[PDB]
Each structure stands twice: as C-alpha cells, then as structure tokens.
Amino acid sequence: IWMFTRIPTAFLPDEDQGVLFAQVQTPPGSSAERTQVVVDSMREYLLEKESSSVSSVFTVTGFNFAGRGQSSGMAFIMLKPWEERPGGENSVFELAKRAQ
Amino acid sequence: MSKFFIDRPIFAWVIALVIMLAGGLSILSLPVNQYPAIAPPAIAVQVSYPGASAETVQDTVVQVIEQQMNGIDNLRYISSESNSDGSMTITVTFEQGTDPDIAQVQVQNKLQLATPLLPQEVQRQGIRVTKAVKNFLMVVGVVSTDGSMTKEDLSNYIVSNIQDPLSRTKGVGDFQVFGSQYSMRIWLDPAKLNSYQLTPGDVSSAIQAQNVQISSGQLGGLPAVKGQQLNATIIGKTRLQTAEQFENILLKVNPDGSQVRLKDVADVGLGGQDYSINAQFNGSPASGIAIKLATGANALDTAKAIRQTIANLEPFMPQGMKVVYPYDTTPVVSASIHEVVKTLGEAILLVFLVMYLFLQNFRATLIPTIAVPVVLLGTFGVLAAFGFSINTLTMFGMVLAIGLLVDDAIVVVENVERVMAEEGLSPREAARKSMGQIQGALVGIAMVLSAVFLPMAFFGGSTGVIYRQFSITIVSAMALSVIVALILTPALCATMLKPIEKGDHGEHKGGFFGWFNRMFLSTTHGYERGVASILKHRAPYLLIYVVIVAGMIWMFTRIPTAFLPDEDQGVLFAQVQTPPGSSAERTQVVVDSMREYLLEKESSSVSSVFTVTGFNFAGRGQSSGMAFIMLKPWEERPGGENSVFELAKRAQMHFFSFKDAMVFAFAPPSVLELGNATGFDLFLQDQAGVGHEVLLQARNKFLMLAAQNPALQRVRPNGMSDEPQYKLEIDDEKASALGVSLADINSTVSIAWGSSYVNDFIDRGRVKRVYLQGRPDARMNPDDLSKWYVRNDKGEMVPFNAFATGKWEYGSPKLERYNGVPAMEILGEPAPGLSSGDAMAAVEEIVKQLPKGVGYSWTGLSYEERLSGSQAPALYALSLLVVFLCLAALYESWSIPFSVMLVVPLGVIGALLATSMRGLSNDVFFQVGLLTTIGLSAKNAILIVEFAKELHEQGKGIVEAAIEACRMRLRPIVMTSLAFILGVVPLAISTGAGSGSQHAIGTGVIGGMVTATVLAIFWVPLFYVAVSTL
Amino acid sequence: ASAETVQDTVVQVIEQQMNGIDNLRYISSESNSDGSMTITVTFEQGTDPDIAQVQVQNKLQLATPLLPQEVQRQGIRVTKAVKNFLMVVGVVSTDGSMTK
Amino acid sequence: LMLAAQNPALQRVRPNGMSDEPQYKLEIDDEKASALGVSLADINSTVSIAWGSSYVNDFIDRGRVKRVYLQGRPDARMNPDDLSKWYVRNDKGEMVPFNAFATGKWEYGSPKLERYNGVPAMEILGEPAPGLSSGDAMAAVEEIVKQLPKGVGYSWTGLSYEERLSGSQAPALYALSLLVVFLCLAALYESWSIPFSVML
Amino acid sequence: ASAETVQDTVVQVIEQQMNGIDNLRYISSESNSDGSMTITVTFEQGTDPDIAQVQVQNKLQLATPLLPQEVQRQGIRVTKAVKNFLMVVGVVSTDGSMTK
Amino acid sequence: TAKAIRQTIANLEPFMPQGMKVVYPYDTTPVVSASIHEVVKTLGEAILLV
Ligand SMILES: CCCCCCCCCCC(CCCCCCCCCC)(CO[C@@H]1O[C@H](CO)[C@@H](O[C@H]2O[C@H](CO)[C@@H](O)[C@H](O)[C@H]2O)[C@H](O)[C@H]1O)CO[C@@H]1O[C@H](CO)[C@@H](O[C@H]2O[C@H](CO)[C@@H](O)[C@H](O)[C@H]2O)[C@H](O)[C@H]1O
C-alpha cells in the first residue's frame, strides 16, 4: 500500500520514433524576412553541428503547428536509423535536450 | 441441469450473482423517458418568405423543393403546407427503424441542391431542416409579470442569455424558442419620402452601401519589398450597430447643401423579425422554449438539470421577467417509476404472506424473495442489451410479468415442500425428485409463452413499437424466470429447507395454522369431489363450456375498441377560429375572454393559460389562435368534476355561446407524438391538374355526403377555407405612359408592404438582421397604397393610384400538398361503436363519387392500420400453431394439447366481463393484459395435464389421474392467484398521474385471474379426460 | 474580419449547435485575424466517425442561417480530424532550373 | 508561464497563442468623403483589391483551371502612408485622393483567439522535467494554477485528458478483475475457501 | 455550352475538390455537346452508399459556389445508383392524338 | 423495386389521359423470375428423379 503511493504516474512510456519538431515562432508583427533567417540558422546549427543522429531537415515558414502568419515557421527533423545511433546522446530525448 | 446445480449451489449462487451485477450495472446506464420512439421518424423543412402569400410560397419555394426531394431511403410519404404568413413546412416521413440522423442528412442534401432554384430572398433567409417528432420533455416560458417587455424582447433574451447555457445543460436535446433575436427595423413613411422624391428602393440600396464590412488586406503582405520586416493586418470598419447609426446613413443632398438622413423618412429601432405569432402567459407578454430529451438521457435528471441552469440565471434577469414551467412530462414519468417499484415490492411482500400462511416456514419464504429480484435485475440487463429504455410501456411490462415471476418461484418451492411431506424425502432428494417432475414442462412452458408473446413484437408501424415494448420486457422476464427456476431455486430448496415427517399436513398444530390446515385440507377433499362429480356427469359441463365460449365472442362484439386509455395528462387544448377577415387584435380578445374565464371561474382545475394569436393546429394567420390550458397537479384537484374530461365539457358549453368565433376544447391524444388516436386521416389529391377550384368542390362534396353517412361523424377538413384577398391590377399601359418602370413598381410594393430583409448589422456581438418596410398606418387599408409614390424617367413621383387598381377575390390562406400534388386533408371518425376499419370502408366508397382527376390517400395512423390490420390474423395463427406443436412434443400426443389450449376462453371471459362491466375499452393495455392472463392460465393447465399424464402412465386410470393431479396442483394455483390478484388491486383502484393506464391493466387481470382460477381447476381435468376418452 | 468578429459572428454560433451531439467529449475552436476559424469537436472512442460527421453536418446547418451572408454563400468545410502527418513527399530541383 | 519557468519539475512550457499583435485600424468616414468624391461606397471596393488580393475568375493553364488574382503592386501596400497613394473616382469625372478621407492608426488586436467548451481560453503545452513523469508535471501544474485571478479556471485536454481518465479507471478495473477471479474459482471448485485463499 | 465549356467551367471545378473521401477507388467524368456532364466517383466494395453520398456532396458543395449561375439554377443531381438501367417505362398514344 | 414501380404507375393510370397507354419497352426483371422459376422446375425434377 505504501509502495503503491510512491510510484509516479504516466500514461505512455516516451518513445524514440526517429523524429523531432522545430517549433519557431518569431515575435509577432515580424515577417518571413526575420523568421526565415531564424529558421535557416537552427536548420544548420543542427544539420552540421549534430549529424550523428539527424539526417534530413525539411524546413517551412508560414504554417507551424501553432498559428499561420509570417511570424511562424517549423521543421520536420528526420533522423537516421536506430543502429546508426548509439544510446544516450543519440536519443531524440537527448538530441533535443541540448538542441533546445 | 437442475440435478447438476442441486449439488452445486455455489456455482448456482455465482450465476445469480453475475445476473444481479449485470442488471444493476445496466439499470444505471439505461435511458429513462416517457415513451420510446412511437411516431414514424420525420423531418421538417422550414422557411418563411417575408411578405409572401400562400401561393407565392407554394409555387416559388415548396414546389421547387418537392421536385428535388427524391432518391432518399426509407421514405413513406412527403406532405407540405404553404401559409399566408409566408411560412412553409415540408415534412418527410420515413419507416420506423430509419436512423433519424441519416434521414435528416439525406433530406438536407437534396434541399441543398434545390437552394439555388429558390428565390434570392428565401435563400437569404436560410431554410432549416430538423427532426419533427413532437415528444417534448417540458416547455418553459419567459413571461414579463408586469408589462415592461414585449414578446419580441423576451425572445431576444432567451436567445441571448437563456439559450447557450440551456444547450450545455446535461441531457438537453433539440428545442424551439418561440421567437428569434432582435431585428433592426426601418419603418418607411410614404409622405416624408414623397417630399424628397425618394422611394423604398433608394433606402435599401443606401443601407446596403453604408453597412457593409469592407475586407481590407494586410500591411506588408506577400510578396513584399526586400526588407520591410513589419507586417500587420489592417482592420477596416465593421457593419453598423445602433439604431442611431442607421438613422444617419444619408440618402441624398439638396442643391441648397442640406442633407437627407434616413431619420428624415422613417423611424428606427430594434424589433421583431417576424410578428405573425403572438403569445401571453395568463395575460402577460411571453416567449419560451420547448425542449426535447437527448438520445440516451434521463428524463428525470434533465428536468432537474434544466431547472438548475435556469435558476442560476434568475438573479440577473431584468425586473419583471419570470421563468415558469407550464408543461412538464416528468411528473407522469416519475409517478410511473414509483407506482411500479411499489407494486413490485408489494408483490414480493404479498408472496411472503401467502407463502407463510400456507407453508408455515420462514426458510421457504426466503426462496421467492431471493429469486424474484434476481430475475427483475436480469430483465433490465436484457433490455439494455437489446437497446430498449426505461419507459411507461417497459415498466407496465414488468407489472404484467409479476404474475409469471411470482408463479415460477411458488411452483418450484411448493412442489419440493409437498414431495417432502408426502414421501418423507430429504430436501436434496425432494428437490431432485421435484425437478424431475417439473422441468420438462418448464422448458415446455418457456417455449409456449414465447409463442404467445413474441408475435406482438412483429407488428408493424407505431402500434408495433408500443406492443414490442410489452412483448420484449415480458419474454425476457419469463425467460429469465425459467432459467432461474432451473438453476438457482431448486439449489436454494435443497439447501435452505428442513425435512417434514412423511404424512404431516399440520392438522395438529392448533391455533390459526391448525384451523387453516384442517380448513384447507377439507376444501381440497371438497374440490376433489367436485372434480370427481364433474368427471361422471360430463355432458352438462362440456355444454356450459360452449356457452362460456359463445359468451366470450358475444362480449368481444360489444366492447368498444380503442388505441390507448383516456389519460389525464395535466393539459387541455382550446382551438380558436375567428372569421375570415379578422385581425390578430380581434382573435386576441376571443382568447382573453377565455383566459379570464378559465383562470377565474375554473380556478379549482386551472393553473395557467398559455394563449396564442397567429398559430393554431389546423392553421395559421391572424384568424387562428389557441389556448394551452394547464392544470394543477392531480393531487390538488380530486373528484370527477375536476377531471380534464369534465373541465372540457364546461369549457365547451361556455365557449359555445360565441356566435362570433368558432371555439373548441379537447383533451390531447394519449400519445402526443402520434396526434389523433381514433379516427381517420386522408388527403384528397388533384392527380391531374384539375385545379384548386375543382379540388375545393371535391372536398366539399366529400364533406356533404360523409355527413349523410351514418358510418362516420365529426368529419371536418383539417386545413383552412378560402378567404377574401385583395388583388392588385397594374395597368402597364398607363405605367409606361407615365415614365414609371414596372420593376420599380414591384420593388415599391415588396419593400414597403411585404417587407424586405436587406442587411446584416451587429447587435451586442452577434449578427442580427436589418428589415425595411412601410410604417403600419401606411399599409392598413386599400386607400393606404394610394399613399405610396414611385419615381419616373425624370423625377416626378407618381402615386400608386395613377396606375394601379384593386379588386376583391378569393384565394387559399393555406395550401397543402401530399406526395408532390395539390391536396386537402380530411379528419373525422367512425360512428359511435363502429370501428375505424368500418369508417375506412364507408370512406373508400364516398371517394368514388369525387370529380374526375381527384384521388386520395390515407396518411398517418390510417395508413399504418391499413397495413398492420392485415398481419394480426397471420401472427395469431403462428402463435396457435407453435403453442400446439410444443404441447405436442411435451406430451407426445397430437390430441392432449387440446386440453390446455381450451383454457384460453376460460380466462378471457372474466377480463371481458370486468372491463366491459367497468366501462373501459378494448385497447392496448387490455390486449397485453389479456395475453398475460392467458399465459398464466395455460401454465396452470400445462402442469395439471403434465402431472396427470405422469400419474396416468405410472399405472392409474384416466379419471383417477385427473383427480390426483388436480389435488396436487390446487395449493400452488390458489397461492399464486391469491398473491397476484392482491398485487394488482392497487392498480385497479388508483387515482391521479397515470391512473387511466393503471386501471386499464388492473381491471382486466383481476377479472381474468378470478374466472381462470375458479374455472380451469374444474374444466381442465374435464378436457383432459374428455379428450383421452375419444 | 478580425479574429474578434470571426469569433462573435461565426465560431460562437456554430459551437451553440454542437452542444447536445451524441458522445461528445469536448469542443475547441480558434478565431484568427486572417478571417479563418476552426472548430474541433472531439468524441469518445467507439463513436462511429462517419455518424459523428453526419451529426455535425446536421447541427451546423441550423447555425448557417444565423451566420453572416458572406459565409452562408461561401461553403463550410467539414472533415475528420487527424492530428498527425504520415509523411511529406517533397520535391527539390537538382540543376537549379526550377524555383519553389 | 513565469511560475512554469520557475517551477523545478516543469520543462519546455509554452502557449499555443501569440499575446496580441499590432493591427492598423483604418478608421475612415463618409461625411468628408461623400462631399467631393464618391457616392455610396465606391471606395469599399478600392480597399479590398489592392491590399487584399481580390479573386476575379478562373483561367486554363496548361490544361487546368487555376485562379486569377488582382492585387496592387508590392510597394503600394507596405506602410501606413503608402496607402495615401491610392486614388479613387470622383462623381464629376475627376480623381479624388485617398487622404481626402483616409485616417489610419495603430490598434492592438489578438491574432488567434481560442475557446474551450464555449468559454474563451488559452492552451499551453509543456513537458515534465528530465527523470520525472507526466503525472509529476501534472501534479505540479495543478499548483501553479492556484495563484490565478478567481475568474480563470482550467481544464485538461489531449494526452492529458487521456491520462486523467486512465488513473480514474484503474480502481474499478482492479475491483472487477479481482471479482471475476473470485467468482470463477468459486464456481469451478465448488467452494469459498479456495477463492478466499488466492485473494490473499 | 460546349463540352469544352462544361469541362472547364463545371467538370474540373468539382473534380479538384473530390478528395478526402473514404474508400475512394476511382473518379471518372464526361462533358458533352448537349451541355450535360457526369462525374462518377466509384468506391471500394463494402462501402456504405449513404456515407459515400454524404462525402461526395460534402465536397461538391465546396465547388458549387464557383460554378456559373446558369448551372446552379439548372439543379444538380447526386445519386447512389447502379450502372445498368433496370427498365424503362414508356407511354404511347392510343388515338394517335399526342406528339412525342 | 420493379414490383414497387408497377404499383406506382398502377396507382396513376386512373388519372391518365385518353389517347394513352403505359408500356414497358426495356425491362431486366423477367430474366430473374425466369431464372429461379426454371431452377425450381429442375429442383422438383431432381427430387423426383432421386
Ligand atoms: C402542451 C403539449 C405539448 C405541446 C408543446 C407546445 C408546442 C410548441 C409549438 C411550437 C410552435 C409555436 C410556438 C408559439 C407558442 C406556442 C405556445 C406553446 C406553449 C405550450 C405550453 C413553434 O412555431 C414556430 O416558431 C418559430 C419561432 O421562430 C417561427 O419562426 C418564425 O419567426 C422567426 C423569427 O425570426 C423567423 O426566423 C422564422 O423564419 C419564422 O418562421 C415558426 O414560423 C413557427 O412555426 C409551432 O411550430 C409549428 O408546429 C407545427 C405543429 O406542430 C408544425 O407543423 C408541422 O408539423 C405538425 C406536427 O404534428 C404537422 O401535423 C403539420 O401538418 C406540419 O405542418 C410546424 O412545422 C411548426 O413550425
């Protein structure tokens, strides 16, 4: 009964499904002028500084998962198979801990 | 199976235990409502074409929609009405079983395809499609106790504040507000407009010009110039909002620089969108909502939850605004759940008593007390599974099932008890012995009763839904009761009962029980002698049997047939019809002289009166009005003199002195959803373009012919009768000779007389509508059109009288169609003591004297009964064939089955006797009650015969076996009859909410239980011997 | 229209009609400053989605006449709502001949 | 969000909305316009064709129906005074300017208003700290929600809604599943001892 | 209207919306000199014809507004029928008094 | 549905004009009736043969 109360609760165990999301949201009022630069940097500071895990990095400005508008962009971060990524610092949970 | 659970009372306890859990888990997911879906699913298509006549609505809207309303599944018929207030309704009606969500989507899709064919003005209105079953849960009423607010204001409020939350209240379904939101009204003055050579058309064009949300793009959109960096939405103006802003939308400016604002030509203020319909609560301006219960909701809980939601709003409501609850169905629903849970309990109590009285043992008394509730709970699980709800009909179903429940338990216990007493066996041994005896016959009787009750389930139509309730709840209980009588109760017997010294019938005990056991021991011997006597002198008795039969038949053809009992719901209708010509103001007085009367003189019965002008149930328009007479709870108005049925008679007489306004009072129908319960419904129909006038001659011939027919009565048209209308002739010769267009004439007459929905403004957030028409005193009389001018080639205002002329003619204030062709509906009913079947026969012959090109079709319950009437004989013949075939297999005999089937009359005679003898009718509750009573009777017969056949086979004479059997079976029979009659009695003598049904069910079973008990105990051995002898 | 108009004249009206729908878990809308809105009606698992859609269409049709004429003539989009993409099928120009 | 950033157990907290944003409140008139310029609302069109790219009709393109848009040049809709460039028609044939009835100021309006169960609302996502579960985060979030101005409540959704359900179920699950084991053993072994032994 | 006119003013405007339809096997169409047209959206075996019809019309009513008024006014038919004719019911004159 | 159709028109013949009879040019149902009637025929022959 004591041991039962001690255990923390989740729903599903977090999984590594070889994917991660960039969620870019420049301060509103801006445009694809700023937004695009803010995006193309983090696309590189990620495609070059982090090519162990990361594979392609499809980017986009306009339609992130939040709003529309020029002050919005994102990216689909595709990764390399599970074999090609040694434990720990190649998990998305880690690849995004410092990517953040 | 029984022998198995006798040694395994724990397993048997477990089964009973899971039946209980399932049933309990089920009783609280189960929908709770007055009735299941009796009416055939239907879909209303509605819209109102402002200013428009019945003709323009029929020929511009209804016809075009009807032409596209096809290729739609399960469609029975389509029927529509076009009205003089510009409203129309097309109702599509589907088979029972049609999913309403599918029906709806199918109808609105074809609407959607037709929408561009409609006039621009109707498209702009909307056209709402909805489910049209009239099975409302309650109706509220937001009434202004003082006179601060009008009907229009109250509405806007209901839709501003009451509505959104009411829709988020748990269990609330579809609902009708009696009115819409505010409309910005603009009332054009013909003189203040003629003085500036301006026309209504200029005002509309202007209003459109200066009240239009301008899109207004983005400030830095895409593409952009390299850099920029700052992008932002540019919000323009949105549409006007206040009356004052509207009063200012400039029309023209004079050469002297002076400007003309809208205010210079008309008044302006928030108002009604449509003023056709008017309603007051006891005298005061009122609106209201009529609410339906959502799929799967609990009728009781939602009524609470409504009142809850409302109350949380009463604080903020303006001064004088009172919410109020004239009609609520919950009292009857609630008064039916209790008046059943009561009778259930009583029955198990009463079984305990007669169980004790006779068996004189507390252990035995517990068995029935366990099993009956086990089975009661089971049945609910079974209902849940099969998709049924807890309703009036499913519950009365449980009440009829009680006899059969109570019996199964008594027969099993009493027989173990007897076997121990006669043969000195031990409980276990007696229990196995007894279930070797019964058992086959129980399986046998489970079949036989299925055969008796299931056919009802395969009735068609509306009456089919009703019977199907009783059918399914009854066979589920019966079936469960048999299962339990084979698993649980013989296990409980083996376990819970003590031994009885062989030969011990308690004649020594002394005291009451000592007296009783000697008394009943003698009664038994007395009965064996009666029977023994009858089996010597047979002929005279078979003779009287034939007299009993002929008596039953004779009696059937003598009792009035009917659909359902005459219930007193707390409500009475009063339809008002002033003369053709009459204004709403006139009608409004006719309905006040009623309210004042009802509300005062009839204070004993009447609580409130909800009155309406412009709406009625045969029609609409200013000569049509009505009162919804509410009535104070059944409790607070006892005695026949304060029955809805009696109040009516008084109300009639009083109103009858109105040689100025046709007025009628009538209790609503048993089941509102269906309307008109006894009678007939049909549409006469122009199936060859003969025309309106011909069609009118047909309906009038029909009427003045049916009234010379002593097979019908009260034969009235449902629609309205043609009334005077003022035609406009326009001489286009003088119009064009004066430089005045023709399209400008029409625009003038629409946008000033009819009214014209121009624009959408914004009121307090929500979007509402801008209406444009002529100020009232400019459009009252024929001379008032001569007040209106139109601009010419140049700028010379030309008065309407310089090119137009009037002329009084007749036309229809309400056009009807049935299945796409013009038509006219006719009601009426069969002559006193004749059947609606007879009435349809008379009518079917009248129809042949109609003009050429006019047919007819039945609709409604007449359409239904025409198809269902044909099947009853077939189903009743299967029923007989299967009951026979089971009895054959059970007794291994083609002939012995006859000795149980011939009890059928024996019980039905006492029912016909009691019900006729007490002035009730051959309706549904009596019919089902009658099958229950014959069920139990045949069960009693089956077992007597079964035991007799066993005794005969172990080597006893036919008469000897019959007497022994009868003696063995008299105790169980008397116990179960004793317990069941007394259980029912309360129904048979009840009063108030639901008492009319409760009487229709009690009266018949008591009667049938009395004659069946006393007669079958003597005639069944007769039949068994009689047939074995052949 | 402003997000505040889109909300007061459209979304709020359509939400009224979606209350009362069988098996409703919750509803979540957005009004945007570009004239766009989305109302999302979510249902308990086991609800048949073809029938939820139909029911949604049934209620919406009642709101429709209460909408601005600029919408009624438009044509409201009703669809089953999946939160997640399965993939992107991209296209890229090798020799630089084609722009975005 | 403040307390979210502060609070030890929370990570990556964020809103789904965007505060407010600058809106150019183009408030115009009719008095100063309808005098020397335009009758009715000839300008109402001028405004929603140059800035707001107006759709006019289709045209076939290499086999396919596509649209034809009509928007003012990029450089003519960039800045607030850049709109005064757009001249309209004068009833008497002449050419009336836009500044003869212009008026355009900055206003602050919301770029994405949200509602939830028919009340305005704001969705805010967030993860749990590393090596804490979603439950811990939830437990935390239900604290940093107590310091809110009475008027503002909360309500879980998506993944979270799904969590809060799964916890509620568990009790009955365990009860019922214990029951069914108890009863089925009690039936198959014709006793109450065995099923009571195995419960323990 | 010419086949070419009906194809590019009506038949293609609808076709471009015919997507996001469940179990959609294939779509075909015809455009003719007599002005008529037909789009036939055929479905997978097992599809509920009621839902197919609801989905088509759901997409068709997004195109409808972009069609020419003279086509809307004519009145569009959406049907869920079999390909062959079941039968034809004819009428003929007795007295030869009635024309075609 | 063929039976249903025969009945809709039958319910309308009484209101038809004078120089006019309804006729059934194409019609697919009779093959169906013919098919099964003809197997019922061979059903009986077999039951007799055996
Ligand atoms: C106690 C026992 C239970 C009864 C409960 C009460 C019944 C509720 C009556 C509801 C009721 C009157 C309400 C007026 C107050 C009445 C006091 C009631 C107080 C009760 C204590 C609502 O009436 C509607 O009110 C609308 C309000 O907006 C109004 O809208 C108008 O203005 C708007 C402004 O903007 C504007 O937008 C809008 O365009 C306008 O049109 C509609 O025109 C008007 O019809 C009547 O509705 C009518 O019902 C008819 C017969 O059922 C029904 O006919 C069909 O179905 C029959 C079915 O059998 C069938 O046989 C008929 O042949 C068939 O034609 C009609 O289809 C239905 O329309």
Residue numbers in the entry:
A (entry chain C): 553 to 652
B (entry chain B): 1 to 1030
C (entry chain C), E (entry chain A): 52 to 151
D (entry chain C): 703 to 902
F (entry chain A): 302 to 351
Could you give the paper's own sentences about this structure?
Newly emerging MDR gram-negative bacteria over-express RND-type multidrug efflux pumps, which cause resistance against an extraordinarily wide range of antibiotics by a single factor. Among the three components of the complex, active energy coupling and substrate recognition are performed by the inner membrane pump. There are two distinct multisite drug-binding pockets; the proximal and distal binding pocket, in MDR pumps. Here we show drug-bound structures of MexB from P. aeruginosa with high-molecular-mass compounds.
Surprisingly, we clearly detected the electron density of bound LMNG in the DBP of the MexB crystal structure, regardless whether or not drug was included in the crystallization medium. The binding site is composed of the PN1, PN2 and PC1 subdomains7 of the binding monomer of MexB. The hydroxymethyl group and the eight hydroxy groups of the glucose moieties of LMNG form hydrogen bonds with the side chains of Gln46, Glu81, Thr89, Arg128, Lys134, Ser180, Gln273 and Arg620. The binding site of LMNG partially overlaps with the ABI-PP and DDM binding sites. One of the alkyl chains of LMNG is inserted into the inhibitor-binding hydrophobic pit. The other alkyl chain of LMNG is elongated parallel in the space above the inhibitor-binding pit. Two maltose moieties are oppositely elongated towards the exit and entrance of the DBP. As a result, the LMNG molecule spreads throughout the DBP space, indicating that the DBP has sufficient space to accommodate a molecule with a molecular mass of more than 1,000, if it can specifically fit to the binding site. When MexAB-OprM was expressed, the growth of the ΔacrBΔrfaC mutant was no longer affected by LMNG, clearly indicating that LMNG is exported by MexB.
